[PDB]
Each structure stands twice: as C-alpha cells, then as structure tokens.
C-alpha cells in the first residue's frame, strides 16, 4: 500500500491514484510576491467554543484527533467559504529533521510541522459524500517552527505514547483546538487536493500567514511514533509530508496587504 517509503511514497502514488498528476493537486508552494490581495475576502470565522474532541488514531501515516461532527459544534465560516464548515479532525505532518516537514512552502522555505485542521461542507450531508464534490472540504492549514513551546499541544504531545504503532487508538475527550492557533488570522487560499491517497480534488485551502511555535521537546514527541503496527520492525514516523505540486491554473489569494 501507499506510504512514504522509497517504494511507496509520492512518486508512486500516480500508479494507482492517477489524479496525482490532475489540474488541482496539493500542497504547493505559496510564493508571496505572486500572491493577489484580495479585499472582497472575508475574515475567517472560526468557532469552536463548542468543540468535542472524542478519540486519538494513529492510522499509520499520522496520527487524527477525531470530533463530534453531528451537529454544528466546531465550524468554519467566512473567508472564502460559502456556508458552514464542520471540523472532523486535525492531524500533523512533519520532518526527520527542522528544516523539513510542512507540505506547504512559502517562497521555498519548509517549516519543521504543519497541522491540518479537516472540515467538510454541511451542505453535503457527511464527509464521504462531501470529498466527492469539489467544494467539499476546507482545510486550515497552520505552519509549525521551532522555539518555545505550544503549551495548548502538550495534552497531545503527552498521550502520544499511548498510541505508537498504526490502528491504536486512546480516548481523547475535552481537548480545545483554539489552543493550537496563532495569534493571526491573515491567510492563503486556493483551490487544492488531499494530500495524501485518495488525492481527491475537493478541498479550498485556507493556509495562516503566522506560524505557531513549538518546543525541540514537542516535535521530538512526534517523531518516536511509529507507522509500523505492534510487533512489526519499528519504522519512525518521520518525514510523513507530500512535496509541493505544480501550480497550473491557479492563483493564490491573500487575506492581508
Ligand atoms: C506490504 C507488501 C505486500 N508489499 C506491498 C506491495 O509490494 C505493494 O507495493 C506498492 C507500492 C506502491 C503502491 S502506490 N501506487 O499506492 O503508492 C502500492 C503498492
Ligand atoms: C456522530 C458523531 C459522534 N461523529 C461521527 C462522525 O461520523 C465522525 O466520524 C469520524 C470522525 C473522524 C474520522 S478520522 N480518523 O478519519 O479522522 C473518521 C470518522
Ligand atoms: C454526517 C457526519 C457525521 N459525517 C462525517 C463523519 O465523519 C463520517 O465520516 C465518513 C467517512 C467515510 C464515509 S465513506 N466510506 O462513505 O466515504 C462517509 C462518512
Ligand atoms: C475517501 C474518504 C472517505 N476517506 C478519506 C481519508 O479519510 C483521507 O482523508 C484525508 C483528509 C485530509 C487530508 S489533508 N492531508 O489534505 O488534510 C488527507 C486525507
Ligand atoms: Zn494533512
């Protein structure tokens, strides 16, 4: 199966997901001199006062904290968005090392992390119809660096061992993702794919100028997961990001002057 292995990872994805070389496929590099502001952009709305997170996955590529999406409790509105967005779930990619890691680039320059916050279009009923429709999903996608710590992601960091190797999961109630946003709500948005298998091309993109901090500590955390099963040969999880895409037709918007 799929992965990011030298014998599974992206540049043999395209031999049984053939929508891996299509018209709108993610991540990309944002290149800020090319950007357009855009001053009929909306400010993002993000409410998640409500939030209930349920469950903690390691699915072996990453690992998924899962909410309650069957009612409007943790939504995206606004910005580039028509209608409501209800959070799924948020996940992280990251490096074997700082200088990589992200999926997204800005002018070339790779982050050490990058979390993605999942959301599907309420208009479509559950999330498997909505990955079928090409405005389906939005996905806030915040960049990670390295310095001080992120307190808001120890409770994840902390459970972490719980859940080593791929299919284990832990109860993860009560945790508050606004913790894990910066101070900032400028952003990117364009028109782009899932990052890994199925590569559906469903998802408005909504990337935050502003990185988050994390401690050495904390990434450290992430990196002794493993994308093994138990009693496996143990494989870190390192390096789990897609490299950027062409840009084709498309352009990159910006929130902010
Ligand atoms: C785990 C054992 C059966 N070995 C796996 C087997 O060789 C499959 O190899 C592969 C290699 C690549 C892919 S793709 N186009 O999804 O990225 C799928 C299967
Ligand atoms: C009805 C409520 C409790 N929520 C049910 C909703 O279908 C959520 O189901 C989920 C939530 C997350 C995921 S994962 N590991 O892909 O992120 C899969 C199914
Ligand atoms: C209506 C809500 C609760 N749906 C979102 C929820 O997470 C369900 O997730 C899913 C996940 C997969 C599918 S499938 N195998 O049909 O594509 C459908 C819904
Ligand atoms: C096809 C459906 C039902 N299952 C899809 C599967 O859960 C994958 O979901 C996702 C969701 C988000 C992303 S990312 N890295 O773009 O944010 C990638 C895969
Ligand atoms: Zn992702």
């Not at 943790?74 to 409501?84: E, I, S």
Request: glycine residues 8%; hydrophobic residues 35%; proline residues 7%.
């Amino acid at each position: 199966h799929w992965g990011y292995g030298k014998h599974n990872g992206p540049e043999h994805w395209h031999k049984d997901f053939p929508i891996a070389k299509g018209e709108r496929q993610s991540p990309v590099d944002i290149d800020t001199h090319t950007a357009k502001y855009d001053p009929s952009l909306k400010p993002l709305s993000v409410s998640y006062d409500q939030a209930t997170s349920l469950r903690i996955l390691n699915n072996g590529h990453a690992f998924n904290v899962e909410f309650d999406d069957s009612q409007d409790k943790a939504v995206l509105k606004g910005g580039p968005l028509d209608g409501t967005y209800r959070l799924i779930q948020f996940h992280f990619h990251w490096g074997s090392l700082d200088g990589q890691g992200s999926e997204h680039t800005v002018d070339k320059k790779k982050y050490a992390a990058e979390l993605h916050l999942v959301h599907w279009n309420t208009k479509y009923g559950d999330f498997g119809k909505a990955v079928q429709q090409p405005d389906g999903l939005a996905v806030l996608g915040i960049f990670l660096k390295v310095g001080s710590a992120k307190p808001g992601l120890q409770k994840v960091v902390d459970v972490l061992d719980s859940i080593k190797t791929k299919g284990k999961s832990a109860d993860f109630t009560n945790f508050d993702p606004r913790g894990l946003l910066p101070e900032s709500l400028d952003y990117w948005t364009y028109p782009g794919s899932l990052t890994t298998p199925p590569l559906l091309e469903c998802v408005t993109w909504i990337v935050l100028k502003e990185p988050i901090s994390v401690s050495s500590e904390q990434v450290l955390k992430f990196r002794k997961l493993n994308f093994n099963g138990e009693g496996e040969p143990e494989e870190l999880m390192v390096d789990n990001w897609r490299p950027a895409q062409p840009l084709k037709n498309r352009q990159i918007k910006a929130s902010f002057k």
